[PDB]
Design a protein around this ligand. Sequence first.
Ligand SMILES: *[C@@](C)(CO)[C@](*)(O)[C@H](Cc1ccccc1)NC(=O)[C@H](Cc1ccc(OC)cc1)NC(=O)[C@H](C)NC(=O)CN1CCOCC1
Ligand SMILES: *[C@@](C)(CO)[C@](*)(O)[C@H](Cc1ccccc1)NC(=O)[C@H](Cc1ccc(OC)cc1)NC(=O)[C@H](C)NC(=O)CN1CCOCC1
Ligand SMILES: *[C@@](C)(CO)[C@](*)(O)[C@H](Cc1ccccc1)NC(=O)[C@H](Cc1ccc(OC)cc1)NC(=O)[C@H](C)NC(=O)CN1CCOCC1
Ligand SMILES: [Mg+2]
Ligand SMILES: [Mg+2]
Ligand SMILES: [Mg+2]
Ligand SMILES: [Mg+2]
Ligand SMILES: [Mg+2]
Lengths: 211, 222, 233, 233, 195, 195, 204, 196, 226
Amino acid sequence: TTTLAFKFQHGVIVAVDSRATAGSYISSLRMNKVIEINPYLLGTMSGCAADCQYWERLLAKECRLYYLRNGERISVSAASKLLSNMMLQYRGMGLSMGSMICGWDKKGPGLYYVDDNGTRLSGQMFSTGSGNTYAYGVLDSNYKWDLSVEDALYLGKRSILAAAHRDAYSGGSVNLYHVTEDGWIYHGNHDVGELFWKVKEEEGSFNNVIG
Amino acid sequence: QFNPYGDNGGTILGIAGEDFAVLAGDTRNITDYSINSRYEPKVFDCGDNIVMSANGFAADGDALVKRFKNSVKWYHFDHNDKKLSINSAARNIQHLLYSRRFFPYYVYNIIAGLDEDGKGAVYSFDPVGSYQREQCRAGGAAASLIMPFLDNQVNFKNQYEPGTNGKVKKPLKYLSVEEVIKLVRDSFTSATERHIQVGDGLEILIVTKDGVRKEFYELKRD
Amino acid sequence: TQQPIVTGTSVISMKYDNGVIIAADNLGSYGSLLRFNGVERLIPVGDNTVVGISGDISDMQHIERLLKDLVTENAYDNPLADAEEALEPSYIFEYLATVMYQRRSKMNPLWNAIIVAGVQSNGDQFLRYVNLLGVTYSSPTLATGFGAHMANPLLRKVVDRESDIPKTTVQVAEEAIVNAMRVLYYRDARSSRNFSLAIIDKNTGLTFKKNLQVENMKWDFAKDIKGYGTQKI
Amino acid sequence: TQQPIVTGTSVISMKYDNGVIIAADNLGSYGSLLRFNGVERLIPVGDNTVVGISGDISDMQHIERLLKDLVTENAYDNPLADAEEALEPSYIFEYLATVMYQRRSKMNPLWNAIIVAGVQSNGDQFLRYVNLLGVTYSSPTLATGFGAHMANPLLRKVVDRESDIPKTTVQVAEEAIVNAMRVLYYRDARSSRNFSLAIIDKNTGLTFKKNLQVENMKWDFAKDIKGYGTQKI
Amino acid sequence: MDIILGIRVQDSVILASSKAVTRGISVLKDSDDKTRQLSPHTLMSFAGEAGDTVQFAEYIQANIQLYSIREDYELSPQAVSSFVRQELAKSIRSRRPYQVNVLIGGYDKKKNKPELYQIDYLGTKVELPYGAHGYSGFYTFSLLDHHYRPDMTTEEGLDLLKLCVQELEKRMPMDFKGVIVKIVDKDGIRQVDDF
Amino acid sequence: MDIILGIRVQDSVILASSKAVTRGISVLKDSDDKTRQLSPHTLMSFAGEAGDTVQFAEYIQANIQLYSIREDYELSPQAVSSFVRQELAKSIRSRRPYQVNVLIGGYDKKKNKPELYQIDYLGTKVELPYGAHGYSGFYTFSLLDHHYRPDMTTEEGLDLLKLCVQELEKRMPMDFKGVIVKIVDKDGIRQVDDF
Amino acid sequence: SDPSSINGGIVVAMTGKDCVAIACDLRLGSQSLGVSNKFEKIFHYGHVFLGITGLATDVTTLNEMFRYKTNLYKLKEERAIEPETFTQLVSSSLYERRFGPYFVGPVVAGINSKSGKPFIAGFDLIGCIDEAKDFIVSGTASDQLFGMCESLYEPNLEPEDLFETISQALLNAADRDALSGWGAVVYIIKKDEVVKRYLKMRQD
Amino acid sequence: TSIMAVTFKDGVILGADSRTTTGAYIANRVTDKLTRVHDKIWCCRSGSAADTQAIADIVQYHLELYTSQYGTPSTETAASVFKELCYENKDNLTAGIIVAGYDDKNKGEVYTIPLGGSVHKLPYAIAGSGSTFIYGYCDKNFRENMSKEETVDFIKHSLSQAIKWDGSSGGVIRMVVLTAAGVERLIFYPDEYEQL
Amino acid sequence: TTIVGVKFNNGVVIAADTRSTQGPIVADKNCAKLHRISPKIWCAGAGTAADTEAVTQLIGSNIELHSLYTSREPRVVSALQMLKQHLFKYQGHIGAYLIVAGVDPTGSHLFSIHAHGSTDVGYYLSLGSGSLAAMAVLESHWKQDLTKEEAIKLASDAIQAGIWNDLGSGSNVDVCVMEIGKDAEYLRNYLTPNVREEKQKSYKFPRGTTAVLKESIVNICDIQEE
Ligand SMILES: *[C@@](C)(CO)[C@](*)(O)[C@H](Cc1ccccc1)NC(=O)[C@H](Cc1ccc(OC)cc1)NC(=O)[C@H](C)NC(=O)CN1CCOCC1
Ligand SMILES: *[C@@](C)(CO)[C@](*)(O)[C@H](Cc1ccccc1)NC(=O)[C@H](Cc1ccc(OC)cc1)NC(=O)[C@H](C)NC(=O)CN1CCOCC1
Ligand SMILES: *[C@@](C)(CO)[C@](*)(O)[C@H](Cc1ccccc1)NC(=O)[C@H](Cc1ccc(OC)cc1)NC(=O)[C@H](C)NC(=O)CN1CCOCC1
Ligand SMILES: [Mg+2]
Ligand SMILES: [Mg+2]
Ligand SMILES: [Mg+2]
Ligand SMILES: [Mg+2]
Ligand SMILES: [Mg+2]
């Protein structure tokens, strides 16, 4: 995996790859690494697929129960903390999970990094998985708060592409999301094979690659 | 030291059609270099138009199938004989597998059937319960041999239209049940040639709105 | 988790037209020491089932008692205990298989390999294997330990697939089993000459043969064999 | 680096007024198996030295040959080989000690513990120990293996220091050695009843006694001992 | 986490804590606040194994806040530090100990004195004029030994702290991304926003 | 040592190498030059196990200087890189292999072309437009993939290199104490004294 | 850690009607990191072609070694070496390092200049010769290639048909291997003309 | 293995089983473990089959060369050559050899060479995995100066019991008789010795 | 592997399967395990494939030079002695398990040889992963005074037992018959009971299906004149 997410003026972008490996064998070309918890809440997945799916789908149960009890949507801060506390029960037992809880609440857009150790960090920009270093390179040099929705979607898409190219354990396709105060919006599945050649020609990047 | 796990070999294959689905698997059961059985069924009709196969460690595979079949029975009792949809079965199986997160069912599981719109459906599981709906999936010993072939011959990967030279892809036309069964048989015949744990026989379960049908084919016994 | 101490070697079996045959030698080994020479490893359950066990003998004796208790329990409040509601081979096997898999799941296995041979109510042949891991499989021929490596190849020459079962008589099947037991005595270092054999037929019932011996052995060619290469005398 | 296979247990010795005594049993053990019952572990060198060896027997036989070859080599071009230029206990010991330390320094030891007992030219008593590590020491009493733990305490009651040597007669010293050998037979699981004993005196020379036995043993009190605590019968 | 420092001057306690958080080979955050306010005049900084640090700190915070409400009274820094030590000494013989080292900086309103307590994950408590955990002390204590006076002003304490951080930035192989500095005095707790 | 980068532009090769040297928990030096001039138009940077790096580099330097004197002729960068690769491939099956990774930047005066060769301690050689060893590539290659053109000027190459170093300084946990940058072109080798 | 799967890569060869084909990917990596997309794994000594997978330093080393040996062969024999003879030379050379082997999976392909007979062969890392009629595979996606070749291949294919079969076998095998891809090359070989084609594939 | 060598009035007899194992698999059930190093000097082999063959082959070579130069070697000389090889290469060998031979001067002699490479001259010797079970029987039943027929029965009965209890031993009982009359090979099949 | 050797009236026969494995994968479906040491001395190998080939070729080379030196036809005991001393020297690290058979002026011979250097004599022998399946057949059907036709049948039956019942063995049966006073006959693919069935479909692609970037002619010819 490579996953990323960042806050900006018009909400938060979420971009992930779709590759799944079992050693050096590519077990899946197209795996959904985002989870729709609620129209205003998203969760990314990196690490053990089973752990990511089970615990974040269990978070959704607990986030849903919050709505029924209080007649109000759970905050991103509270949702991330519930998840971190779950990880803390199975302390040292061998869970492998790295996720970003992305959403919009009363404080505005929210983004929290959460992992198997129980770490819970608030921040503007995060990237997880084996290819995060490649993604950070593109993000750090091109990120601004003043980004347009169109340019921001491209940045997250381009950042995953950078990782998919270099990292052997990242690739397949790119899944894009955009989180607004009216909820999250899916911006499609983009094959890296096609996207790479397209970006190469249009952007002029990847000069060293022949095509 | 006691090793509670073992490897019974075998290979399974699930393909989702437009209005049908197939779940195939070889009938050979093995330990190390010995053949236990040349015909030991691996794909099962679990009721409600769902078929399932748990490949890997046979004892854990049999246990999981047994528990899911049981889960189907209790779903009828508890919810007024309601039909268990394929998506609901898949989620139920995730929770069956994750019960043993720290002492897993050592199996790669596949189920097949029809979704609530009547279209073909295949779901894939890892030993600890991560699952996803798929069009095509091979599991087990010879999974790495078969999957690339299906990427090419089912989803037409790396295939383009002559004359255009890489500009226009081969269009993703749907496959018939007769066409799918040909790809399944050729997949297992090829796997049998190059993998020692694959052979003896091939049993295919085909699922349509009419029900669950079986087909059997001999494989090389060496 | 344990280690097996006193052990029993191969158990071999096969289906034939009207029933099943099962056999096993009468030895209880203690490592390389051939300690106990009067051990019965075929255990009948009623008049329709024989359970053949290999592996740890203390665990075998435990299983032997579970089966004896199973018969007692089935007879409780059961007027049809010797008729319609008698124990079937499939019932006895599934019980054992449940026990074996539960024990492996508690990391405290019964260190055995078991073959349940019998004939069902409807006359169908029953033959299935289960071991310490809870692994189960069925085949026209089944064998444990060394028998799997040496006996199955010989028995599969008689019944290579399901369609060969009706063509195989009890005389041919017994002959094949007895030959296999001789071959195992030639080649298995933890085997004995003395063995037991059981036939469960749908017409003639359960025939239990004890104190059998491997006979018609070929050793005479040994006199000509001298040295390990260049030695002539 | 190796491991000892066939082994010899304790060698015990002590000084007395006119010489030294040394003794060792005639057993060659193979682990817990008492394999060889006719092994001589005291090896005389001339008429003034006896070398007692414990530990690996194959290495003992090697040393036995080095000593035999040493005597041969000393006689070469030596008209005084049976007189002034004969082999002394101190020469024989220092040779062995040189060999033992060299072998340990090549990480390929002679897996032994050796005691060289003898009388020098000037009548002085010689008694010194050397082992696989090349470690050497001298004392009025010396013993290897179990003998160090059980025999030395008994022998040190007779000769506790250097000044007790002139006060100790050969009859007292032999009596003490023989008692110690009995005690070792009672308590050492790798010992035997049969042993050899050698006396090297400055007046009467070398007396080599073979086929000795442990006698006057106390066992009768065993009949009264019953159970391990509460048992009366 | 990495570096946490503490210095007690004439009329205040100053805590400096690194901003970096690292997962694998990547620095995830460079603005992390490794501290929790236990009471209006008591601050606790922390460093140790991932996750454990914050859980422990928040668990302590909850307990002290509960006490404050129940009694309508603020516990002395000494009393809080003893409570924390006991929780850690209890923890070290548990099935899975909490691997957290802490510094507790507080102003005792009764005695009108600043107080600094250093407690490691074993439950080893010491009251000090200046303290540190991990390797931080190896680089900094020589400077503090030389320059520290007990009659120092808060401004002098900050200058001496800058010198310590500069030495760390020169001789430590790890980039800890600077420090967040907080002051604890009679008027409460405040953060130095420019350092 | 830690980070060594390399980039080949239109008419030159630029090598950037970290300045830090660490023993135990202490940074001994922050001005170390991890490079050797093999010939007037060939420069080799290096990174690997302590000691081995310099010995190997100096041993190569001596061999190339010997060749230059014997033949009164400068070996091509390609020829030098092949010689170096062979020495490393020879080394990897030795009793105690030399654990050194290198970048060879040279200007071929015959072809009038800059050339950059990346060789690891196994003897794995590759000619590249830009290269790195260790973890350096994980952070930097995404930027280079995006921004690199083959017709770049030396000044544009330095600006792109600054961006790479800035990204390293942000996301690497280790403080490598900046880099020494050197340029290899038709006129020879020179050091950029302000970076 | 495993030397045969650090750098990654694949090679496949096929026979056709009066022709042979050999193909390889272009990736060189350091485990997860992709380093080069121009690392060709097929070399030729006269009309004999050799593909080598595995540890890249040994691939490079062996190429230089067989170049050395085939150039001397030619000087002494006064003729180019043939595929059958070269295959034995490869086997000899690998087995001479029996207890310190090159971590490689070589593949020979060529047409005998005298008989006109197409020839392919594969080896294990210590020299065991696998002389196949149909196809030879090697690399980190060897399992994948076996599956593709075994189903796609049919005998007596014409050069331009064989090209499509071997290309699709390589491409789709590489796309199920993390350590293979980043470009591909296919050699089509006839008795006195050889065509080399670079394939367009996904770059992830 | 179960092997033994026994001296008697007219000379010496060697005896052995015929089972060779690889774990629990009997790789050879008709093995000849009685091997000739000289006309009337034979040995019984136990331990590693490769090691004991390589040794016996070297010994045979040494004694053939001895014979060419110095005439017929003694049984003691043969045992010394075995010992020298077994002792000096003890770290790399696993060989338990019994040496038996007939001189006219010394008559029947038996030397056993266990693992360490020590030598032990005995009236009779037993070795191999199956020997453990017959230490009691052999000690109680052995007499010096037995007849040929008595010695054959003693070996037959002894190895019969060793085979009965040891899974590593089995097959036929081979014997080699060494006397002034010459060299006689004997064989005894299971049906004969099992009923004893 | 499965390999066997069987003695008969006037000679000896050896046989082998044709499967070679790399893990659970079949590397070669029709490999050749029957190796020639000399014209009338052949041996079958199991274990490390390259070791069985190399050790056989080395000894065969030295046997040829010996035969030339002595002006005599090579003997099986010579090949056996040379093989065991070579294998013993390498302490099992050369993983060659061989069945050596042949005819020479002394007669007909059959030996087995393990990787550590131990040799073994017999009338019938089997080696490899399928040796137990094969030995079961040999123990069931072997007898003294076999004819040539009976021995070939027994040998191939023994190999089949390995092919069908052992996963480490498969494909075809190779045989070599060595009879006294005759040329040795090598019967490559004596049996072929594992031919693949016709595939259901042809996977021949339309020309132009694969995307291409560049094309170029490769110069294989030498530097040209003029
Ligand atoms: C990239 C691909 C790194 O490989 C991502 O991290 C990816 C994230 C992801 C998230 C949700 C859904 C799919 C994929 N991770 C994986 O694909 C993951 C890699 C991984 C395996 C094991 C780990 O330690 C437990 C950590 C990471 N792959 C899987 O989870 C695969 C599909 N399944 C398994 O590994 C299941 N195991 C369970 C035990 O039996 C053996 C196989
Ligand atoms: C009985 C069976 C066991 O002690 C005998 O000693 C017997 C003696 C014998 C056999 C054949 C020819 C002459 C004499 N020995 C064996 O059958 C022997 C068992 C053994 C093996 C290895 C040993 O230590 C290294 C000790 C005893 N069998 C073998 O040597 C067989 C042929 N080969 C193997 O078991 C293969 N081994 C070789 C050593 O490394 C492990 C694999
Ligand atoms: C059957 C197939 C064993 O499964 C046979 O013994 C067969 C014999 C044979 C002889 C000549 C020609 C072809 C085949 N052996 C193999 O096919 C052998 C299997 C094997 C693998 C590993 C082993 O331990 C190291 C022993 C046997 N296959 C090979 O040797 C293949 C070609 N090579 C490798 O797997 C690479 N080896 C080289 C040796 O070092 C370990 C990896
Ligand atoms: Mg990638
Ligand atoms: Mg198969
Ligand atoms: Mg490199
Ligand atoms: Mg790839
Ligand atoms: Mg026996």
